[PDB]
């Protein structure tokens, strides 16, 4: 079941405006939109989904994941966006001509206002540990980067600032194994 990712989890944000990816009209021909890690058992945007907590209850996961974006702008506002997944290796890509060598989908703003980037299973081993920290970077998954394909064009008498809601779920080949305790609660007040 898809669940709203928390991609805007940075500072200088309140609670409700924390689940929205701001989209504006950039003057330069190519700029970078929001980007985030794929690892669901890692501190970040995946911590806010149900799949992330379920993967937090276990220690090893497998199978493909699905990230579903959704444009919540105006009807007259159009544009194309590039959602590109990159396998492990180097760090986040700097520009679009480097990030477009991986797995990407061109998504245009039409009548249907939702695209679903699938994240394939390109791991060397069968299972990945949700630890993924420091010397555990052997089990990293990659980086999903959202780039501006053409632009966010807007007609006059129309607001030029939209938002994108990111959802996430798991495919049918999703597999979990080895039950453990979560790390979202360490202490507790005497009830």
């Amino acid at each position: 079941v898809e669940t709203i990712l928390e991609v805007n989890n940075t500072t200088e944000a309140t609670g409700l405006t924390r689940l929205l990816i701001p989209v504006s009209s950039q003057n330069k021909a190519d700029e970078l939109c929001a980007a985030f890690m794929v690892d669901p058992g890692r501190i970040g945007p995946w911590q806010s989904t149900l799949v992330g907590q379920i993967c937090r209850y276990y220690t090893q996961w497998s199978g493909s994941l699905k990230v579903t974006f959704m444009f919540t702008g105006s009807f007259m506002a159009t544009g194309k966006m590039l959602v590109a997944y990159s396998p492990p290796g180097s760090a986040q890509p700097a520009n679009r001509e480097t990030a477009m060598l991986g797995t990407h989908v061109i998504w245009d703003f039409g009548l249907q206002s939702s695209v679903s980037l699938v994240i394939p299973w390109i791991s060397n081993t069968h299972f990945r540990t949700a630890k993924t920290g420091g010397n555990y970077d052997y089990y990293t998954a990659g980086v999903v980067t959202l780039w501006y394909q053409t632009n966010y064009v807007v007609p006059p008498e129309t607001p030029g600032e939209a938002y994108i809601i990111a959802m996430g779920a798991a495919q049918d080949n999703f597999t979990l194994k080895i039950c453990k305790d979560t790390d979202e609660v360490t202490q507790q007040a005497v009830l």
Binding site: A29, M76, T78, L82, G102, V105, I106, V118, Q149
Partner: protein, 246 residues
């Protein structure tokens, strides 16, 4: 069920909402080289998953005083990824291409773009000198612009002495901002030789020229990017040797 389309090549996908029909250039699909037309003896390699995928280039801001941009397609992917690496090590090359040009706007913007391919798109020098030593010739960055692209100086003559009006004989598609926001062309391998070097010979080249200028009222968005995605379908490589850059 005609305005929506999802093209999947490799590990990439392109979804669309406002689309026309896909264009198949000259009614021929891009396939592999048969044994009757081939001439090399060594066996060619076919990755089929590592070079056959959608590569996204940069975006160019469509302004109001814009003339147009163009590209040499066997030379744009000459340095980007496994395709470029595999093309630097080999001497022979033969593939088709799948194109997709993204340009979205609101329902209050107006304009039209002409995106088409021209086999053997030769850039002509601009001048009125007939002496051999001073006759103007285009530089290497003008003939082969690379992954960035080049702009037109006289887009009415396609920078080649041939009028833009008569350029509708080529495999073309329109991007009308009131009808669609993308254009898709599938072009096969078009050459008089079976294989060829993908370094010192570009087979064809894309060109995007705004025929109707971009117009909008004061208050709407002003940054209109032009994004292009290319899939090298049915790629073949032969003659493995040292890697050369240019």
């Amino acid at each position: 069920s005609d305005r929506v389309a999802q093209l999947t090549v490799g590990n990439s996908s392109i979804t669309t909402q406002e689309a026309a029909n896909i264009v198949l250039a000259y009614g021929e699909w891009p396939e592999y080289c048969p044994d009757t037309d081939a001439t090399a003896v060594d066996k060619p390699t076919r990755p089929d998953v590592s070079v056959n995928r959608f590569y996204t280039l940069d975006s160019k801001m469509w302004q109001e005083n814009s003339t147009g941009w163009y590209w040499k397609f066997p030379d744009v992917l000459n340095k980007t990824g496994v395709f470029g690496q595999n093309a630097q090590f080999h001497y022979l090359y033969r593939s088709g291409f799948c194109l997709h040009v993204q340009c979205n706007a609101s329902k209050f913007h107006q304009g039209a773009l002409l995106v088409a391919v021209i086999p053997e798109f030769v850039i002509a020098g601009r001048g009125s000198n007939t002496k051999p030593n001073e006759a103007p010739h285009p530089g290497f960055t003008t003939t082969f612009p690379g992954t960035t692209g080049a702009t037109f100086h006289d887009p009415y003559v396609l920078d080649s002495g041939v009028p833009l009006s008569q350029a509708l004989i080529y495999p073309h598609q329109w991007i009308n901002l009131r009808t669609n926001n993308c254009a898709t062309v599938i072009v096969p391998y078009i050459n008089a030789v079976p294989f060829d070097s993908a370094i010192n010979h570009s087979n064809f080249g894309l060109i995007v020229i705004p025929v109707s200028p971009l117009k909008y009222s004061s208050g709407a968005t002003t940054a209109i990017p032009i994004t292009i995605t290319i899939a090298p379908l049915n790629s073949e490589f032969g003659g493995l040797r040292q890697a050369v850059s240019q």
